[PDB]
Design a binder for this molecule. Structure first.
Ligand SMILES: [Mg+2]
Ligand SMILES: [Mg+2]
Ligand SMILES: [Mg+2]
Ligand SMILES: [Mg+2]
Ligand SMILES: [Mg+2]
Ligand SMILES: [Mg+2]
Ligand SMILES: [Mg+2]
Ligand SMILES: [Mg+2]
Ligand SMILES: [Mg+2]
Ligand SMILES: [Mg+2]
Ligand SMILES: [Mg+2]
Ligand SMILES: [Mg+2]
Ligand SMILES: [Mg+2]
Ligand SMILES: [Mg+2]
Ligand SMILES: [Mg+2]
Ligand SMILES: [Mg+2]
Ligand SMILES: [Zn+2]
Lengths: 136, 62, 211, 25, 83, 132, 101
RNA sequence: AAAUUCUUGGACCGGCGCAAGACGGACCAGAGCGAAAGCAUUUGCCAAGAAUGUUUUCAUUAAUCAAGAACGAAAGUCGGAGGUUCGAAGACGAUCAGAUACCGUCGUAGUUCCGACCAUAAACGAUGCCGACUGGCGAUGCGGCGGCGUUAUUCCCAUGACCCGCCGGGCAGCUUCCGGGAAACCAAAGUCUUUGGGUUCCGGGGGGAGUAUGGUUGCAAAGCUGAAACUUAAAGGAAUUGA
């Protein structure tokens, strides 16, 4: 729980995988390989109503909790892998992406590289909904 | 979690579903480099000081 | 708190790169059947080339897989090459032709690789028209030129030398130079290098990859 | 009533007429 | 223009016309004398040869057919003829 | 909403050229001008006419106004319009001539003028804007 | 009466273009008829670039873009105001609106 | 907005692999080919095809076409294989006065491949085919021809990539007091009371009605052919002004 044994003067790097969907936000810090989870706080566990799971306020609250727990383990800098739902469905990142990443930059973390890892398909299976679409 | 106070730089316009809240951009006197846009309820001049309970969320423009 | 029984291991890149330290990794310490070594034997690291080289491009990434643990030091090897999505999505623009090719080739040692490559037709400085396309038969002879080149700087040497060629864009550069006589094309890169089969592991070989 | 549903209703009616005639033939 | 003379066009605008659309039809092809750099005889070759023509004696080849005019091999001089 | 109606604007635009010499710069003096020089049915309308005339004069000083022709300003145009130089701008001891027009001249009886000069035509037909 | 010369689409000598799926809802729209929008934005808004830049471990770090192409049906285009109805004379011109900002 | 739904028996999320079946984004355009339906990863094989080029060959061999023939989206039908996704029917949760719907969770037939049926679509350019003539302008695709000039081979001829033109078919675009039209509009929907180039199909106020019946095709669903009694002063097209 103390963290890495290393002298100062260098950063130790983790990676946060941000999943900014339209229904909630996942802030999920892991090591370089991605195999070891270090802290996963979701935007939906910081609100009392499930209408606000995707709120930018929840994303800000989630990132602050992740950053504070990240400081405990000793990680100082993060690489960003922004991600929308992607795949067959919509590919634009949700409202929580902007606020979740801004919080990590204001909570003492150091931002490394930013990349987009949304899963675009070469072509996927037929999409949910009728031929007439989701009409309302 | 401290509380910040800031000064408005200009008045951007009147917003809200009924025109009751104003968007202005605030400028901290603690830090002369950071400015953000916030909604404010009530009549607001230029140069007055707004007490910000929390100063982390940004108000979308109209 | 599981993180109390977790220790940290350093990760070392092969000697063929300038910078040695990738970072640090976690693992649950050896407790009964679960050995701390086997948990670190299949880690894959996506590191950009600008991180490994002292000063190079930032749009190329390499997959480094840990092979052995020599005691607080994980030993990695080349596993795959990849081109960042930001750059990849930026080269694809309208009113031009995309040309793609792939080859399956085995180096002198038993390493089997897939090499995906991309190239786009370039518009003249003098050009007035907008389309800037290529005939189908020109596209065919460019990519057969593009396959026949890439297979010769890989099957003639070993895994060490092909990665040395991968650090610059030498494979992409030669494709540019050869195919200009057919149709001049500008944004040529080796888009992706998948590695299919490894040879049987021999610890002596790895220690040459790490000095 | 659009012509699509009108002709659907007509087809159902014709099917019943044909069945009832084949009942007696 | 209204009073354009259809009987008398200048050779400038009559050459650009389609071979069938001239005032009177006339082919655009011609014959020519092709001499190899090696031998001394001169052969008559159609401009749009449409076949691989080679000089007798099996010395070399003369022309290579294309989608239009035939192209002559390197070094073979040609001069067209009239009558 | 202090917008001048056409009745106030038209009288000001008529008074001003007929008495530009008398009308001045201040509002109170030319308020006295308008009262006798034109019949105004009411005071409040006289003040608005006189006030606009005061505003119009300041515009006239900087430059001519398109609506009003002050008798002193169009007479300045005649000396601006009747100006002629002393040496013709069309007289040159050498002129830049492209070769093809020298052939166009050659087809005429002007085979060789005295003050012609052959200039090299541009190489590369780069005269169409790129398409996009 | 026939509203548009080309019947709302760009099919002129084909007889069949493959359909696609809109992005707002999953409506099936022909590829030529659909309203394409190729947006190119930063990962972070202009209000957050300084915050990220002050936190970057590098120096003079370029900010990555995010390229995605949107497809819209006619109904979803009118409702999202990407396009709107024009006068009969104004329907014919087809240059895009000004790209000044 | 929620709920049905999964969830310490560890869901969602992160990595590493494996399996299957669909699908071929971005490039992708008022661009190409095909009789229409339709057709988009690489490579190989087989047969075909328009256009261009031609001082080659035959010499009227042609155009349109009752009866007849081949192809014909999707859905549907019959036998095998496979069944990832989506999803008629169906079940449930919402919404609602009701909701056998729109919205959400699951989900059968189907959607996929093979071998046979079916012959219908707003199968649309709502516009038969062949031929002739009657304004421009700028592009685009294919073939050929000509020409200052840049660039690659390199080692120059010649080839590719640009540039400027001409010719022939092709999908189209802009403009016009050609002309027409009820107008919308059309360079064809023009060359029409100044009416006749050739030829096929097809309409005769609105319904009843693509109905009844007879025939014929089909495993079936259904396809083609197809009335009458009776009822009705309108039904409809284009454009204008209000609401
Ligand atoms: Mg449904
Ligand atoms: Mg609606
Ligand atoms: Mg209408
Ligand atoms: Mg169709
Ligand atoms: Mg593709
Ligand atoms: Mg028939
Ligand atoms: Mg079918
Ligand atoms: Mg079926
Ligand atoms: Mg079956
Ligand atoms: Mg219900
Ligand atoms: Mg449903
Ligand atoms: Mg489902
Ligand atoms: Mg029909
Ligand atoms: Mg019809
Ligand atoms: Mg007649
Ligand atoms: Mg009738
Ligand atoms: Zn839609």
């Amino acid at each position: 729980s103390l963290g890495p044994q290393v002298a100062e003067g260098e950063n130790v790097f983790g990676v946060c995988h941000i999943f900014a969907s339209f229904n909630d936000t996942f802030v999920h810090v892991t090591d370089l390989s991605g195999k070891e989870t270090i802290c996963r706080v979701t935007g939906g566990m910081k609100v009392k109503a499930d209408r606000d799971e995707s709120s930018p306020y929840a994303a800000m609250l989630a990132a602050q909790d992740v950053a504070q727990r990240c400081k405990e383990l000793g990680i100082t800098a993060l690489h960003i892998k922004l991600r929308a739902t992607g795949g067959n469905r919509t590919k634009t990142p949700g409202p929580g992406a902007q606020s979740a990443l801004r919080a990590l930059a204001r909570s003492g973390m150091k931002i490394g590289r930013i990349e987009d890892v949304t899963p675009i398909p070469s072509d996927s299976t037929r999409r949910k909904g009728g031929r007439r679409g989701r009409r309302l | 979690q401290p509380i910040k106070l800031a000064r408005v730089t200009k008045v951007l316009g009147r917003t809200g579903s009924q025109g009751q809240c104003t968007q202005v951009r605030v400028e901290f006197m603690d830090d002369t480099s950071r400015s953000i846009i916030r909604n404010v309820k009530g009549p607001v001049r230029e140069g007055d000081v707004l007490t910000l309970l929390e100063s982390e969320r940004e108000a979308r423009r109209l | 708190d599981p993180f109390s029984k977790k220790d940290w291991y350093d990760v070392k890149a092969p000697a063929m790169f300038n910078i040695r330290n990738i970072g640090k990794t976690l693992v649950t310490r050896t407790q009964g059947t679960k050995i701390a070594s086997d948990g670190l034997k299949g880690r894959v690291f996506e590191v950009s080339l600008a991180d490994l080289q002292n000063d190079e491009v930032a749009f190329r990434k390499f997959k480094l897989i840990t092979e052995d643990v020599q005691g607080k030091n994980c030993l990695t090897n080349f596993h795959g090459m990849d081109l960042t999505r930001d750059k990849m999505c930026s080269m694809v623009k309208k009113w031009q032709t995309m040309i793609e090719a792939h080859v399956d080739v085995k180096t002198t040692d038993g390493y089997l690789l897939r090499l995906f490559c991309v190239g786009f037709t370039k518009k003249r400085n003098n050009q007035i028209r907008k389309t800037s396309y290529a005939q189908h038969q020109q596209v065919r002879q460019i990519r057969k030129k593009m396959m026949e080149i890439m297979t010769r700087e890989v099957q003639t040497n070993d895994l060490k030398e092909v990665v040395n060629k991968l650090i610059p864009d030498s494979i992409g550069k030669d494709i540019e130079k050869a195919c200009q006589s057919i149709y001049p094309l500008h944004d040529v890169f080796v888009r992706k290098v998948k590695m299919l089969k490894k040879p049987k592991f021999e610890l002596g070989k790895l220690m040459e990859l790490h000095g | 009533m659009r012509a699509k549903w009108r002709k659907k209703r007509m087809r159902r009616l014709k099917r019943k007429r044909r069945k009832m005639r084949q009942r007696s033939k | 223009p209204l009073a354009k003379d259809l009987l008398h066009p200048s050779p400038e605008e009559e050459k650009r016309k389609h071979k069938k659309k001239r005032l009177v039809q006339s082919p655009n092809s011609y014959f020519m004398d092709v001499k190899c750099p090696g031998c001394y005889k001169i052969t008559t070759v159609f401009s749009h040869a449409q076949t691989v023509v080679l000089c007798v004696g099996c010395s070399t080849v003369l022309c290579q057919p294309t989608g239009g005019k035939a192209r002559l091999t390197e070094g073979c001089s040609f001069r067209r003829k009239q009558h | 909403g202090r917008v001048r109606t056409k009745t106030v604007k038209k009288a000001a635009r008529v008074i001003i050229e007929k008495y530009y010499t008398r009308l001045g710069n201040d509002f109170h003096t030319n308020k006295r001008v308008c009262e006798e020089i034109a019949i105004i049915p009411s005071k409040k309308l006289r003040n608005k006419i006189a006030g606009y005339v005061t505003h119009l004069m300041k515009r006239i000083q900087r430059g001519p106004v398109r609506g009003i022709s002050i008798k002193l300003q169009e007479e300045e145009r005649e000396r601006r319009d009747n100006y002629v130089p002393e040496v013709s701008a069309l007289d040159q001891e050498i002129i830049e001539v492209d070769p093809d027009t020298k052939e166009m001249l050659k087809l005429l009886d002007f085979g060789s003028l005295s003050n012609l000069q052959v200039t090299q035509p541009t190489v590369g037909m780069n005269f169409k804007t790129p398409r996009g | 009466t026939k509203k548009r010369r080309n019947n709302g689409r760009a099919k002129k000598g084909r007889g069949h273009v493959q359909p696609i799926r809109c992005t707002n809802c999953a409506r099936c729209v022909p590829k030529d008829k659909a309203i394409k929008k190729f947006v190119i934005r930063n990962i972070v808004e202009a209000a957050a670039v300084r915050d990220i830049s002050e936190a970057s471990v590098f120096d003079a770090y370029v900010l990555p873009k995010l390229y995605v192409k949107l497809h819209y049906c006619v109904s979803c285009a009118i409702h999202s105001k990407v396009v709107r109805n024009r006068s009969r004379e104004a329907r014919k011109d087809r240059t895009p609106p000004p790209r000044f900002r």
